[PDB]
Structure 1
Amino acid sequence: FRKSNLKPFERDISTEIYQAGSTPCNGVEGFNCYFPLQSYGFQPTNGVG
């Protein structure tokens, strides 16, 4: 998730809780307030894709 889109050749290393609603979460993980960097799930028996 991100607020606005990226520019060409722009990188973003941000560790902040992103509010998906109206309540402000000052460093609080909660509901409509989560962590943007979700990991991948690479296991070898997955299909191609």
Structure 2
Amino acid sequence: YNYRYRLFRKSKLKPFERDISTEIYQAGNKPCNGVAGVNCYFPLQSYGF
């Protein structure tokens, strides 16, 4: 599970483009604080190896 892939981003990545920005996409007033739920989805996911 060491290898992890960026599952979600606000916009599609450009060709030959690297993005390491881990800022969360908070869609509401509720702070995520690492909690998965309303308006809070983590952009990274561990590989299902």
TM-score, length of structure 2 as denominator length: 0.55
Paired residues of 1:17 and 1:34 also in contact (CA < 8 A): yes
State the Cα RMSD in Å. 2.0
- Bigger strand share: 2
Equivalent pairs counted in the alignment come to: 40
Partner SS state of residue 38, structure 1: strand
For residue 28 of structure 2, the aligned residue among 14, 18, 22 is 22
Q: Which structure: larger Rg?
A: 1
For residue 3 of structure 1, the aligned residue among 4, 10, 20 is 10
TM-score, length of structure 1 as denominator length: 0.55
RCO comparison, higher one (Cα < 8 Å, 6+): 2
Percent identity at matched positions? 73
Query: In 1, Cα distance between the equivalents of 2:45 and 2:21?
Result: 13
